Write a protein that binds this ligand. Structure first.
Ligand SMILES: N#Cc1c(NC(=O)c2cc(S(=O)(=O)N3CCOCC3)c(Cl)cc2Cl)sc2c1CCCC2
Length: 454
């Protein structure tokens, strides 16, 4: 990073002083103590557990200073009213100091997100950084900003939303030079009411943009009432300014033609939507000085993006929600608070399969028990646990939940009831159920998700 502790303190409105501390140039920002290095800035957030607990473990790992809502003593600390707010203001300031061009994209997808594609095309001419994984919310975006390599010219930021107004905040924080909305109306769409509202929240991606900035929005009418007034708006889709005039899909390949492009394009993936993503990403890449040739070559060696947590279905008509990455307690807690917000389907049955999260440290077991506060008997009908460190949590669940609503399957270097787990899961899994699957990845967890799909 390119910041110093007094700088940060000044930018954040430190309630303490800082003059008392060294005022040393910092290395990088981390909210995961387990990630801190020598000279890093520690940012304690409210997660599975409060981050403030880990402050000490932070300096032990190298922290040179720490944000904090309370006096730290005998340690360099910047005192603020709220650490997340402080973290966001700081990311915002870093954007102003850097003057990097920001490209906001909203709407993940699956195989190859617009975010990765666009970042990929920009990489052909510029030093470009992007949102890693799914770090696209009020914690992830700020984080992505601060981890931007020195000299970045193009920053592609993906922005997700759980509640209306989430994107408005992100737009205001990042101030995108250009923005893209891919949209689609969610089904059981938890926390959100209906398509129009999802579209309303996504169109907020424009709120923090300067007048005349380019914004790509789909042809779908669902966004009409939310269009910005003083922006350069380009519509994509059949009939719109930008459109796919021809498409061909192989078994694992794709070839399509975009009206504004004179040549065709090839992608190592299959999907009408991937084509559109590629197209809209191309348009923005073009506006930034990238040639159709450079673009054409780049799509030659794209790069698939490991599934991307979303719904799917097991040969049964089930609603499988397998959260792939982010194997940490906060992520689990969050995936739980969401999965348990989505009301049940037809019949109305809710199931969650939780497994061990490796590498949590000597605090692993305690961290798994913490999930108990995120498990409600009323909303979840069956919770199945698979592992070792998660056993104490299963025991807690068996006491808190009704008789018979919990299951536990062993998994150690001695024994592994993977056999019985699949058997049990398959048995409980009804054709109109929603099964949540979360836990560090493993050969078995993968086989299990497959026994459902097959
Ligand atoms: N409590 C807690 C812990 C962690 N929490 C997170 O790493 C964390 C994760 C997320 S996230 O994974 O859900 N989020 C990220 C960036 O944005 C997208 C997803 C968000 Cl929000 C906040 C946070 Cl504090 S890691 C870890 C512990 C306990 C001790 C052992 C290691």
């Amino acid at each position: 990073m390119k910041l110093t502790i007094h700088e940060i303190a000044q930018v954040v409105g430190a309630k303490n002083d800082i003059s008392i501390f060294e005022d040393t140039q910092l290395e990088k920002a981390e909210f995961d103590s387990r990630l801190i290095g020598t000279g890093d800035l520690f940012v304690p957030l409210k997660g599975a557990r409060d981050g403030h607990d880990f402050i000490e473990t932070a300096f032990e790992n190298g922290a040179a200073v720490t944000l904090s809502e309370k006096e730290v003593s005998n340690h360099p600390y910047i005192l603020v009213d709220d650490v997340l707010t402080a973290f966001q203001s700081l990311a915002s300031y870093y954007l102003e100091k850097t003057t990097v061009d920001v490209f906001a994209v909203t709407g993940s997808n699956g195989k190859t997100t617009t975010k990765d594609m666009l970042a990929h095309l920009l990489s052909t001419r510029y030093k470009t950084y992007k949102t890693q994984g799914n770090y696209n919310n009020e914690i992830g975006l700020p984080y992505t900003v601060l981890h931007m390599p020195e000299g970045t010219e193009k920053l592609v930021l993906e922005m997700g939303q759980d509640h209306l107004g989430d994107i408005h905040l992100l737009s205001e924080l990042a101030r995108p030079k250009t923005a893209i909305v891919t949209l689609v109306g969610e089904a059981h769409l938890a926390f959100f009411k209906d398509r129009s509202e999802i579209a309303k929240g996504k169109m907020q991606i424009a709120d923090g943009m300067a007048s005349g900035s380019l914004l790509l929005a789909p042809a779908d009418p669902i966004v009409e009432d939310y269009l910005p007034i003083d922006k350069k708006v380009v519509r994509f889709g059949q009939g719109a300014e930008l459109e796919i005039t021809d498409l061909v899909e192989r078994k694992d390949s794709l070839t399509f033609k975009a009206n504004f492009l004179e040549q065709a394009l090839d992608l190592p993936v299959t999907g009408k939507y991937n084509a559109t993503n590629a197209m809209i990403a191309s348009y923005v890449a073009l506006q930034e000085g990238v040639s159709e040739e450079q673009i054409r070559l780049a799509f030659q060696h794209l790069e698939l993006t490991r599934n991307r947590t979303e719904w799917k279905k097991a040969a049964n008509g089930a609603d499988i929600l397998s959260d792939v990455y982010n194997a940490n307690p906060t992520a689990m807690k969050l995936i739980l608070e969401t999965f348990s917000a989505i009301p049940a389907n037809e019949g109305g049955k809710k199931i969650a399969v939780l497994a061990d999260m490796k590498e949590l440290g000597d605090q692993s077991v305690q961290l798994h028990n913490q999930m108990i506060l995120s498990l409600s008997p009323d909303v979840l009908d069956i919770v199945i646990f698979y592992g070792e460190d998660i056993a104490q949590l299963a025991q807690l669940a068996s006491q808190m939940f009704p008789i018979g609503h919990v299951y536990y399957f062993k998994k150690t270097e001695d024994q592994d009831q993977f056999e019985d787990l699949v058997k049990q899961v398959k048995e409980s899994l009804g054709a109109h159920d929603q099964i949540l699957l979360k836990g560090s990845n493993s050969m078995n967890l993968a086989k299990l998700v497959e026994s459902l799909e097959n």
